[PDB]
Design a protein around this motif. Structure first.
Motif, PDB file in Angstrom:
ATOM      1  N   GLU A   1       0.811  -1.210   0.000  1.00 29.11           N
ATOM      2  CA  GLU A   1       0.000   0.000   0.000  1.00 29.11           C
ATOM      3  C   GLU A   1       0.850   1.269   0.000  1.00 29.11           C
ATOM      4  OE1 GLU A   1      -2.854   0.758  -0.754  1.00 29.11           O
ATOM      5  OE2 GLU A   1      -3.128   2.791   0.061  1.00 29.11           O
ATOM      6  N   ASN A   2       1.944   1.262   0.764  1.00 33.60           N
ATOM      7  CA  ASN A   2       2.898   2.379   0.742  1.00 33.60           C
ATOM      8  C   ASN A   2       3.348   2.617  -0.703  1.00 33.60           C
ATOM      9  OD1 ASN A   2       4.807   4.298   2.006  1.00 33.60           O
ATOM     10  ND2 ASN A   2       6.407   2.868   1.279  1.00 33.60           N
ATOM     11  N   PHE A   3       3.802   1.545  -1.351  1.00 30.86           N
ATOM     12  CA  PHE A   3       4.299   1.664  -2.716  1.00 30.86           C
ATOM     13  C   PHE A   3       3.191   2.128  -3.674  1.00 30.86           C
ATOM     14  CE2 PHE A   3       5.913   0.355  -6.868  1.00 30.86           C
ATOM     15  CZ  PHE A   3       7.255   0.647  -6.810  1.00 30.86           C
ATOM     16  N   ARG A   4       2.008   1.518  -3.579  1.00 29.09           N
ATOM     17  CA  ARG A   4       0.871   1.886  -4.431  1.00 29.09           C
ATOM     18  C   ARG A   4       0.540   3.386  -4.328  1.00 29.09           C
ATOM     19  NH1 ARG A   4      -3.905   3.385  -4.735  1.00 29.09           N
ATOM     20  NH2 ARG A   4      -3.853   3.620  -2.453  1.00 29.09           N
TER      21      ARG A   4
ATOM     22  N   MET B   1       1.257  15.813   0.459  1.00 30.09           N
ATOM     23  CA  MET B   1       2.586  16.216   0.957  1.00 30.09           C
ATOM     24  C   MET B   1       3.055  15.412   2.165  1.00 30.09           C
ATOM     25  SD  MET B   1       2.944  18.415  -1.356  1.00 30.09           S
ATOM     26  CE  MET B   1       4.393  19.418  -1.086  1.00 30.09           C
ATOM     27  N   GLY B   2       4.353  15.127   2.212  1.00 28.63           N
ATOM     28  CA  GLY B   2       4.939  14.374   3.320  1.00 28.63           C
ATOM     29  C   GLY B   2       5.351  15.300   4.459  1.00 28.63           C
ATOM     30  N   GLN B   3       5.709  14.717   5.603  1.00 26.65           N
ATOM     31  CA  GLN B   3       6.368  15.469   6.691  1.00 26.65           C
ATOM     32  C   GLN B   3       7.637  16.210   6.229  1.00 26.65           C
ATOM     33  OE1 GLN B   3       6.943  12.522   9.848  1.00 26.65           O
ATOM     34  NE2 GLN B   3       4.754  12.094  10.072  1.00 26.65           N
ATOM     35  N   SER B   4       8.296  15.698   5.186  1.00 31.20           N
ATOM     36  CA  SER B   4       9.518  16.319   4.668  1.00 31.20           C
ATOM     37  C   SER B   4       9.293  17.661   3.956  1.00 31.20           C
ATOM     38  CB  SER B   4      10.232  15.365   3.697  1.00 31.20           C
ATOM     39  OG  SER B   4       9.519  15.263   2.477  1.00 31.20           O
ATOM     40  N   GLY B   5       8.045  17.939   3.585  1.00 29.49           N
ATOM     41  CA  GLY B   5       7.713  19.111   2.777  1.00 29.49           C
ATOM     42  C   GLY B   5       7.726  18.817   1.284  1.00 29.49           C
ATOM     43  N   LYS B   6       8.074  17.572   0.922  1.00 29.73           N
ATOM     44  CA  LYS B   6       8.031  17.109  -0.485  1.00 29.73           C
ATOM     45  C   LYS B   6       6.773  16.271  -0.728  1.00 29.73           C
ATOM     46  CE  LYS B   6      12.443  18.379  -0.228  1.00 29.73           C
ATOM     47  NZ  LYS B   6      13.053  18.565   1.114  1.00 29.73           N
ATOM     48  N   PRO B   7       6.274  16.246  -1.995  1.00 25.76           N
ATOM     49  CA  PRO B   7       5.113  15.393  -2.304  1.00 25.76           C
ATOM     50  C   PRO B   7       5.461  13.923  -2.106  1.00 25.76           C
ATOM     51  CG  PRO B   7       5.516  17.016  -4.052  1.00 25.76           C
ATOM     52  CD  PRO B   7       6.748  16.955  -3.204  1.00 25.76           C
ATOM     53  N   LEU B   8       4.522  13.179  -1.522  1.00 22.91           N
ATOM     54  CA  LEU B   8       4.632  11.732  -1.382  1.00 22.91           C
ATOM     55  C   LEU B   8       4.340  11.062  -2.740  1.00 22.91           C
ATOM     56  CD1 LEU B   8       2.720  11.612   2.039  1.00 22.91           C
ATOM     57  CD2 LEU B   8       5.164  11.037   1.657  1.00 22.91           C
ATOM     58  N   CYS B   9       5.292  11.166  -3.660  1.00 22.36           N
ATOM     59  CA  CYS B   9       5.079  10.655  -5.009  1.00 22.36           C
ATOM     60  C   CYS B   9       6.396  10.328  -5.697  1.00 22.36           C
ATOM     61  CB  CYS B   9       4.228  11.637  -5.856  1.00 22.36           C
ATOM     62  SG  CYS B   9       3.762  10.986  -7.484  1.00 22.36           S
ATOM     63  N   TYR B  10       6.407   9.214  -6.429  1.00 23.00           N
ATOM     64  CA  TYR B  10       7.623   8.769  -7.116  1.00 23.00           C
ATOM     65  C   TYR B  10       7.877   9.553  -8.407  1.00 23.00           C
ATOM     66  CZ  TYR B  10       8.146   4.572  -4.097  1.00 23.00           C
ATOM     67  OH  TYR B  10       8.343   3.694  -3.037  1.00 23.00           O
TER      68      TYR B  10
ATOM     69  N   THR C   1      13.070  12.795  -1.451  1.00 18.15           N
ATOM     70  CA  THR C   1      13.346  13.902  -0.519  1.00 18.15           C
ATOM     71  C   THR C   1      14.775  14.442  -0.599  1.00 18.15           C
ATOM     72  OG1 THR C   1      13.924  12.645   1.525  1.00 18.15           O
ATOM     73  CG2 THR C   1      11.564  13.042   1.106  1.00 18.15           C
ATOM     74  N   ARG C   2      15.743  13.582  -0.921  1.00 23.39           N
ATOM     75  CA  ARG C   2      17.153  13.989  -0.957  1.00 23.39           C
ATOM     76  C   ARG C   2      17.922  13.549  -2.226  1.00 23.39           C
ATOM     77  NH1 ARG C   2      18.847  12.287   5.303  1.00 23.39           N
ATOM     78  NH2 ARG C   2      16.997  13.216   6.302  1.00 23.39           N
ATOM     79  N   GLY C   3      17.274  12.759  -3.083  1.00 18.37           N
ATOM     80  CA  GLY C   3      17.862  12.250  -4.339  1.00 18.37           C
ATOM     81  C   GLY C   3      19.129  11.386  -4.325  1.00 18.37           C
ATOM     82  N   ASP C   4      19.608  10.982  -3.152  1.00 17.26           N
ATOM     83  CA  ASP C   4      20.964  10.425  -3.063  1.00 17.26           C
ATOM     84  C   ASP C   4      21.089   9.140  -2.261  1.00 17.26           C
ATOM     85  OD1 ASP C   4      20.728  11.385  -0.464  1.00 17.26           O
ATOM     86  OD2 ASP C   4      22.193  12.993  -0.734  1.00 17.26           O
ATOM     87  N   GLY C   5      19.970   8.632  -1.766  1.00 18.57           N
ATOM     88  CA  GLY C   5      19.992   7.407  -0.996  1.00 18.57           C
ATOM     89  C   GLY C   5      19.960   7.623   0.486  1.00 18.57           C
ATOM     90  N   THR C   6      19.930   8.883   0.925  1.00 25.71           N
ATOM     91  CA  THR C   6      19.822   9.162   2.357  1.00 25.71           C
ATOM     92  C   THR C   6      18.381   9.514   2.759  1.00 25.71           C
ATOM     93  OG1 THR C   6      20.494  11.526   2.211  1.00 25.71           O
ATOM     94  CG2 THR C   6      22.270   9.905   2.532  1.00 25.71           C
ATOM     95  N   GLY C   7      17.529   9.799   1.778  1.00 25.19           N
ATOM     96  CA  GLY C   7      16.214  10.353   2.090  1.00 25.19           C
ATOM     97  C   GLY C   7      15.064   9.438   1.731  1.00 25.19           C
ATOM     98  N   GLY C   8      13.900  10.053   1.536  1.00 27.42           N
ATOM     99  CA  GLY C   8      12.650   9.339   1.255  1.00 27.42           C
ATOM    100  C   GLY C   8      11.782   9.281   2.512  1.00 27.42           C
ATOM    101  N   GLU C   9      10.495   9.017   2.322  1.00 26.06           N
ATOM    102  CA  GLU C   9       9.588   8.855   3.464  1.00 26.06           C
ATOM    103  C   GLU C   9       8.344   8.086   3.063  1.00 26.06           C
ATOM    104  OE1 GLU C   9       6.881  12.087   5.118  1.00 26.06           O
ATOM    105  OE2 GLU C   9       8.087  13.357   3.805  1.00 26.06           O
ATOM    106  N   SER C  10       7.814   7.332   4.021  1.00 26.78           N
ATOM    107  CA  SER C  10       6.676   6.499   3.738  1.00 26.78           C
ATOM    108  C   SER C  10       5.370   7.291   3.887  1.00 26.78           C
ATOM    109  CB  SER C  10       6.646   5.295   4.696  1.00 26.78           C
ATOM    110  OG  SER C  10       6.084   5.645   5.958  1.00 26.78           O
ATOM    111  N   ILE C  11       4.284   6.701   3.398  1.00 21.98           N
ATOM    112  CA  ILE C  11       2.963   7.301   3.605  1.00 21.98           C
ATOM    113  C   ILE C  11       2.545   7.309   5.106  1.00 21.98           C
ATOM    114  CG2 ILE C  11       2.182   6.799   1.216  1.00 21.98           C
ATOM    115  CD1 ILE C  11       0.308   4.573   2.615  1.00 21.98           C
ATOM    116  N   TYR C  12       3.242   6.523   5.924  1.00 20.70           N
ATOM    117  CA  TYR C  12       2.959   6.443   7.364  1.00 20.70           C
ATOM    118  C   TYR C  12       3.748   7.479   8.149  1.00 20.70           C
ATOM    119  CZ  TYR C  12       1.514   2.080   5.321  1.00 20.70           C
ATOM    120  OH  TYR C  12       0.960   1.149   4.503  1.00 20.70           O
ATOM    121  N   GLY C  13       4.544   8.277   7.435  1.00 22.66           N
ATOM    122  CA  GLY C  13       5.344   9.330   8.055  1.00 22.66           C
ATOM    123  C   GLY C  13       6.599   8.719   8.634  1.00 22.66           C
TER     124      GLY C  13
END
Length: 172
Positions: free
Chosen positions: A37-40, A49-58, A78-90
């Motif tokens: 579901e997270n992936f979907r 929008m995520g907690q990061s301030g970026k859209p929750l979208c691939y 969120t960071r483009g480099d392998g350090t970032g990202g966030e789930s739909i669950y925050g």
């Protein structure tokens, strides 16, 4: 749209300035519902929008780590480099390890240790049994295996892409 009772999602991909085509994926919602579901939802961007301030979208993100004869990895919007990202669950729990990395073209979660699932994912290009019980497998490629192979060709031993590989659209 569903396949064998499970949701189907897609990525459209470009490599450099050139469209490379579409990857469609089945998500194992029946046995891996939380991760599926997270992936979907991140494919559709339906959560906003995520907690990061970026859209929750691939859409708009890159495959930032690409290792030929291993896997292609993306999902860091969120960071483009392998350090970032966030789930739909925050981050979220490893929900189970029902599926193993026994074939190429499986979807599995990248992570930084136990129970650290975010949005980063990889598509295997070989069986990866050394990842079993550490990374949650949650889907597989249905069509666009050749697109996956095209992306893989843009990789390096050190994982650095030699071309910009972008998810130009995503959803159901």
């Amino acid at each position: 749209l569903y396949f064998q009772g499970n949701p189907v999602v897609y990525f459209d991909i470009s490599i450099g300035q050139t469209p490379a085509g579409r990857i469609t994926m089945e998500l194992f919602a029946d046995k891996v519902p939380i991760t599926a579901e997270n992936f979907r939802a991140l494919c559709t961007g339906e959560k906003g929008m995520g907690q990061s301030g970026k859209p929750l979208c691939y859409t708009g993100s890159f495959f930032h780590r690409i290792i030929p004869q291993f896997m292609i990895q993306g999902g860091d919007f969120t960071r483009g480099d392998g350090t970032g990202g966030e789930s739909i669950y925050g981050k979220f729990r490893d929900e189970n390890f029902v599926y193993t990395h026994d074939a190429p073209f499986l979807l599995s979660m990248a992570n930084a240790g136990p129970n650290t699932n975010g949005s980063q994912f990889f598509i295997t290009t070989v069986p990866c049994p050394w990842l079993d019980g550490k990374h949650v497998v949650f889907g597989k490629v249905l069509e666009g295996m050749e697109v996956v192979k095209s992306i893989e060709k843009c990789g390096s031993q050190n994982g650095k892409p030699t071309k910009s590989v972008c998810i130009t659209a995503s959803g159901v």
